[PDB]
Structure formats: C-alpha cells, structure tokens
Design a protein around this motif. Structure first.
Motif, PDB file in Angstrom:
ATOM      1  N   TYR A  18       0.828  -1.193   0.000  1.00  0.00           N
ATOM      2  CA  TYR A  18       0.000   0.000   0.000  1.00  0.00           C
ATOM      3  C   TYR A  18       0.869   1.254   0.000  1.00  0.00           C
ATOM      4  CZ  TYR A  18      -4.035   2.928   1.051  1.00  0.00           C
ATOM      5  OH  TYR A  18      -5.039   3.863   0.992  1.00  0.00           O
ATOM      6  N   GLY A  19       0.263   2.371  -0.386  1.00  0.00           N
ATOM      7  CA  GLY A  19       0.972   3.636  -0.385  1.00  0.00           C
ATOM      8  C   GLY A  19       0.013   4.804  -0.366  1.00  0.00           C
ATOM      9  N   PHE A  20       0.460   5.885   0.267  1.00  0.00           N
ATOM     10  CA  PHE A  20      -0.296   7.128   0.278  1.00  0.00           C
ATOM     11  C   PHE A  20       0.693   8.281   0.312  1.00  0.00           C
ATOM     12  CE2 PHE A  20       0.123   8.943   4.522  1.00  0.00           C
ATOM     13  CZ  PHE A  20       0.627   7.881   5.244  1.00  0.00           C
ATOM     14  N   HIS A  21       0.222   9.449  -0.108  1.00  0.00           N
ATOM     15  CA  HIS A  21       1.081  10.607  -0.283  1.00  0.00           C
ATOM     16  C   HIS A  21       0.574  11.771   0.553  1.00  0.00           C
ATOM     17  CE1 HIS A  21       2.843   8.154  -3.180  1.00  0.00           C
ATOM     18  NE2 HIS A  21       2.409   8.705  -4.299  1.00  0.00           N
ATOM     19  N   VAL A  22       1.507  12.621   0.970  1.00  0.00           N
ATOM     20  CA  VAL A  22       1.203  13.849   1.690  1.00  0.00           C
ATOM     21  C   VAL A  22       1.767  15.006   0.884  1.00  0.00           C
ATOM     22  CG1 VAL A  22       1.570  15.188   3.775  1.00  0.00           C
ATOM     23  CG2 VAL A  22       1.136  12.729   3.930  1.00  0.00           C
ATOM     24  N   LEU A  23       0.897  15.923   0.478  1.00  0.00           N
ATOM     25  CA  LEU A  23       1.273  17.052  -0.361  1.00  0.00           C
ATOM     26  C   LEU A  23       1.143  18.333   0.443  1.00  0.00           C
ATOM     27  N   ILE A  24       2.229  19.081   0.540  1.00  0.00           N
ATOM     28  CA  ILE A  24       2.235  20.345   1.255  1.00  0.00           C
ATOM     29  C   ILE A  24       2.740  21.387   0.267  1.00  0.00           C
ATOM     30  CG2 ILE A  24       3.014  21.582   3.291  1.00  0.00           C
ATOM     31  CD1 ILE A  24       3.487  18.704   4.576  1.00  0.00           C
ATOM     32  N   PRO A  25       1.862  21.941  -0.584  1.00  0.00           N
ATOM     33  CA  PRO A  25       2.318  22.952  -1.550  1.00  0.00           C
ATOM     34  C   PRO A  25       2.647  24.293  -0.920  1.00  0.00           C
ATOM     35  CG  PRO A  25       0.244  21.893  -2.220  1.00  0.00           C
ATOM     36  CD  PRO A  25       0.450  21.587  -0.780  1.00  0.00           C
ATOM     37  N   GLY A  26       2.126  24.574   0.275  1.00  0.00           N
ATOM     38  CA  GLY A  26       2.331  25.885   0.871  1.00  0.00           C
ATOM     39  C   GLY A  26       3.779  26.156   1.230  1.00  0.00           C
ATOM     40  N   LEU A  27       4.439  25.202   1.891  1.00  0.00           N
ATOM     41  CA  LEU A  27       5.827  25.382   2.312  1.00  0.00           C
ATOM     42  C   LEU A  27       6.739  25.552   1.100  1.00  0.00           C
ATOM     43  CD1 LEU A  27       6.069  22.740   5.176  1.00  0.00           C
ATOM     44  CD2 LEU A  27       5.935  25.187   5.466  1.00  0.00           C
ATOM     45  N   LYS A  28       7.808  26.323   1.259  1.00  0.00           N
ATOM     46  CA  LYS A  28       8.813  26.591   0.233  1.00  0.00           C
ATOM     47  C   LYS A  28      10.166  26.685   0.921  1.00  0.00           C
ATOM     48  CE  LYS A  28       6.167  26.499  -3.204  1.00  0.00           C
ATOM     49  NZ  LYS A  28       6.253  26.200  -4.659  1.00  0.00           N
ATOM     50  N   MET A  29      11.007  25.691   0.713  1.00  0.00           N
ATOM     51  CA  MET A  29      12.320  25.580   1.343  1.00  0.00           C
ATOM     52  C   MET A  29      13.320  24.975   0.364  1.00  0.00           C
ATOM     53  SD  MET A  29      10.228  22.907   2.070  1.00  0.00           S
ATOM     54  CE  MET A  29       9.601  22.882   3.763  1.00  0.00           C
ATOM     55  N   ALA A  30      14.600  24.999   0.719  1.00  0.00           N
ATOM     56  CA  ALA A  30      15.657  24.461  -0.118  1.00  0.00           C
ATOM     57  C   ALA A  30      15.609  22.936  -0.123  1.00  0.00           C
ATOM     58  CB  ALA A  30      17.023  24.953   0.357  1.00  0.00           C
ATOM     59  N   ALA A  31      16.320  22.345  -1.084  1.00  0.00           N
ATOM     60  CA  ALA A  31      16.365  20.890  -1.182  1.00  0.00           C
ATOM     61  C   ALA A  31      17.009  20.273   0.052  1.00  0.00           C
ATOM     62  CB  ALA A  31      17.117  20.475  -2.447  1.00  0.00           C
ATOM     63  N   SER A  32      18.089  20.882   0.544  1.00  0.00           N
ATOM     64  CA  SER A  32      18.760  20.355   1.726  1.00  0.00           C
ATOM     65  C   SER A  32      17.854  20.416   2.950  1.00  0.00           C
ATOM     66  CB  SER A  32      20.061  21.118   1.973  1.00  0.00           C
ATOM     67  OG  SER A  32      19.815  22.503   2.134  1.00  0.00           O
ATOM     68  N   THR A  33      17.011  21.444   3.057  1.00  0.00           N
ATOM     69  CA  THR A  33      16.078  21.586   4.175  1.00  0.00           C
ATOM     70  C   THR A  33      15.050  20.464   4.119  1.00  0.00           C
ATOM     71  OG1 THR A  33      16.243  23.994   3.847  1.00  0.00           O
ATOM     72  CG2 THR A  33      14.704  23.261   5.481  1.00  0.00           C
ATOM     73  N   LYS A  34      14.562  20.124   2.919  1.00  0.00           N
ATOM     74  CA  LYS A  34      13.641  19.002   2.767  1.00  0.00           C
ATOM     75  C   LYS A  34      14.323  17.687   3.112  1.00  0.00           C
ATOM     76  CE  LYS A  34      11.545  21.475  -1.097  1.00  0.00           C
ATOM     77  NZ  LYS A  34      10.815  21.397  -2.390  1.00  0.00           N
ATOM     78  N   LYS A  35      15.587  17.535   2.712  1.00  0.00           N
ATOM     79  CA  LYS A  35      16.332  16.333   3.062  1.00  0.00           C
ATOM     80  C   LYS A  35      16.482  16.200   4.571  1.00  0.00           C
ATOM     81  N   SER A  36      16.721  17.310   5.272  1.00  0.00           N
ATOM     82  CA  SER A  36      16.798  17.359   6.741  1.00  0.00           C
ATOM     83  C   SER A  36      15.476  16.965   7.397  1.00  0.00           C
ATOM     84  CB  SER A  36      17.217  18.764   7.190  1.00  0.00           C
ATOM     85  OG  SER A  36      17.165  18.873   8.598  1.00  0.00           O
ATOM     86  N   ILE A  37      14.371  17.540   6.921  1.00  0.00           N
ATOM     87  CA  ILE A  37      13.033  17.193   7.399  1.00  0.00           C
ATOM     88  C   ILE A  37      12.801  15.690   7.219  1.00  0.00           C
ATOM     89  CG2 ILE A  37      10.553  17.533   6.954  1.00  0.00           C
ATOM     90  CD1 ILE A  37      11.402  20.554   6.266  1.00  0.00           C
ATOM     91  N   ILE A  38      13.009  15.146   6.018  1.00  0.00           N
ATOM     92  CA  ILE A  38      12.665  13.751   5.756  1.00  0.00           C
ATOM     93  C   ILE A  38      13.594  12.817   6.525  1.00  0.00           C
ATOM     94  N   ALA A  39      14.848  13.229   6.727  1.00  0.00           N
ATOM     95  CA  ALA A  39      15.754  12.451   7.560  1.00  0.00           C
ATOM     96  C   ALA A  39      15.260  12.396   8.997  1.00  0.00           C
ATOM     97  CB  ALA A  39      17.161  13.043   7.498  1.00  0.00           C
ATOM     98  N   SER A  40      14.723  13.498   9.525  1.00  0.00           N
ATOM     99  CA  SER A  40      14.211  13.527  10.894  1.00  0.00           C
ATOM    100  C   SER A  40      12.940  12.679  11.043  1.00  0.00           C
ATOM    101  CB  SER A  40      14.021  14.973  11.358  1.00  0.00           C
ATOM    102  OG  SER A  40      12.952  15.620  10.708  1.00  0.00           O
ATOM    103  N   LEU A  41      12.070  12.654  10.026  1.00  0.00           N
ATOM    104  CA  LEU A  41      10.880  11.801  10.031  1.00  0.00           C
ATOM    105  C   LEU A  41      11.189  10.305   9.890  1.00  0.00           C
ATOM    106  CD1 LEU A  41       8.121  13.122  10.507  1.00  0.00           C
ATOM    107  CD2 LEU A  41       9.583  14.731   9.311  1.00  0.00           C
ATOM    108  N   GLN A  42      12.303   9.912   9.260  1.00  0.00           N
ATOM    109  CA  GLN A  42      12.600   8.503   9.029  1.00  0.00           C
ATOM    110  C   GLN A  42      12.693   7.706  10.323  1.00  0.00           C
ATOM    111  N   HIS A  43      13.271   8.284  11.375  1.00  0.00           N
ATOM    112  CA  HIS A  43      13.475   7.584  12.638  1.00  0.00           C
ATOM    113  C   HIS A  43      12.462   7.995  13.699  1.00  0.00           C
TER     114      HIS A  43
END
Lengths: 135, 126
Positions: A18-43
């Motif tokens: 199964y799979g589902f997606h979360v879309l947040i078009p409002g936020l606007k940040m750099a690629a590294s900032t998104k990588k930091s966010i997703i790294a923090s959510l992984q654990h």
C-alpha cells in the motif's frame, strides 16, 4: 500563516503493498532543508507505532528519502498501467510563530469545488486556497 | 407577568403536560426548604424537589419539549460540592453595541483548558 495538508491514497493495495502521499504545496524551502526534514521523520517512533496496528510490517522503512529530489507527478496523472492516487481528504493548519498555543487542525470544506490540479501543484503560486509560505 | 404564565400554561399543551406531571407525579418528591435532598428549585412556585434519575430523564425531556416552543420558565437547580463547572462573564461594553467569532471561542476554550490543567489534577488517560 496558513499551512494545508493533503492525503492522496492508492485506490487499492496490490500484492500487499500500500501507499499514500502527503502534499504540502504551501511550504517553500531548499532541497537540503527538505532532506533534513525527511531524515528527521525517518526515525520518528510516533508514526511507526501509529502504523504498527495498521498492518505495516516495517513502518520504519516506508518513507522514500528521494522524495525531495525525484520529480513529482501532477494530481490525476499516473504511471504506465497504474491508477492515479485519489485525494482521500485535505487538512488545513493555522500556525502563528508569534505565540504557539495550539495548532487548530481542521478539514478543508468543499475541496471538491476546486481546481485540484492547480491547487496541489508544488510549484504553483496562484492557488486560490494554497498560499505561498516563503521559508 | 402572571398573565403571561396563564397564557402559556392554559394555551400550550407542552406546559400543560409539564405542570400535570409536576403536580401529580413529582409532588411526592417535594422537599422542605434547606434540605440537602434539594436538586431542583422552582423560583416561581418556590418549591424544591428531590428527583431520582429515573424521573429526572422524563423531567428533562418534558422541560426540553417546553423549551422548543419558547415556553417561559425559570426552573433552577442546586449544585453541591461535586458537580460540573459553570462560568459567568458579565461583560461591560464601553459602546452600546460583540461579534464573538468562533475562532475566538476556540482560543478562549483552549485557554480555559490550559488553566484547568495548571490549576487542577485531571484523571490520567484519554
């Protein structure tokens, strides 16, 4: 500021996948900032234990890190012999950096009366409901 | 005011049913003034009662039936040491004319809950 969340869900789980997606078009940040966010959510143990009773074998390894780099498909589009994801619901959040006391998470009303492709576009800036929150 | 009471009493079936129940069935639950059994105060007739839950449900149903027609009543209740929480806010408007937006009410409700948490001990759990 106003921050909107959307939850597009796969029409059906295929071969127990199964799979589902979360879309947040409002936020606007750099690629590294998104990588930091997703790294923090992984654990994050909270989401994983939420998914433990959800029939999720490995809630830890469910979030694809490449999400901040791989180009995203527009709403309604899909892959060869794949069915497009369906927007189950869309949430809206109000955040006041002046003084956070409680985030009022509610549901967006009349989401169907809207240009969903235009609203959910990540690079869009003229959304009637989605608004540009420049971080 | 008594002419209004007569009008609603005689000229509205709901108030007739209410008063018939009070006079015929609920009179046996009457309490002398100041008794700790007092749970309901009728500020018109000046009578206090002691109703158990089983007739409390029917009393509340009848009372709501009267309210749905806008019937006039002043039925009070005596709260003891252990009961729900009640708040009164007699605001003094500088102008003769407020909005009281829903989001404002959410803010005040959250603030009230914060104060309850800080100023009391709440049961553990959900």
């Amino acid at each position: 500021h106003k921050i909107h969340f959307f939850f597009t869900l796969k029409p059906e789980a295929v071969q127990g996948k199964y799979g589902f997606h979360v879309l947040i078009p409002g936020l606007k940040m750099a690629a590294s900032t998104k990588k930091s966010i997703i790294a923090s959510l992984q654990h994050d143990a909270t989401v994983q234990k939420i998914l433990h009773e959800q029939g999720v074998a490995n809630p830890e390894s469910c979030l694809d890190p490449h999400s901040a780099s791989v180009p995203s498909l527009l709403y309604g589009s899909s892959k060869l012999n794949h069915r497009p994801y369906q927007l189950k619901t869309g949430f809206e959040l109000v955040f006041d950096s002046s003084d956070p006391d409680y985030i009022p998470i509610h549901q967006i009303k009349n989401i169907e009366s809207y240009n969903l492709v235009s609203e959910l576009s990540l690079t869009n800036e003229q959304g009637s409901l989605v608004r540009p929150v420049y971080c | 005011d008594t002419i209004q009471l007569t009008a609603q009493r005689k000229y509205l079936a709901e108030v007739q049913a209410l008063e018939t129940l009070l006079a015929r069935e609920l009179s046996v639950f009457l309490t002398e003034p100041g008794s700790k059994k007092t749970n309901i105060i009728n500020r018109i007739t000046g009578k206090t009662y002691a109703l158990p839950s089983t007739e409390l449900l029917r009393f509340y149903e009848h009372l709501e039936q009267c309210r749905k027609q806008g019937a006039l009543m002043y039925f009070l209740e005596r709260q003891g040491t252990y009961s729900g929480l009640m708040l009164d806010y007699d605001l003094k408007l500088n102008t003769n004319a407020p909005s009281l937006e829903s989001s404002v009410l959410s803010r005040l409700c959250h603030r009230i809950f914060v104060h309850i948490k800080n100023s009391s001990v709440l049961p553990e759990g959900s």
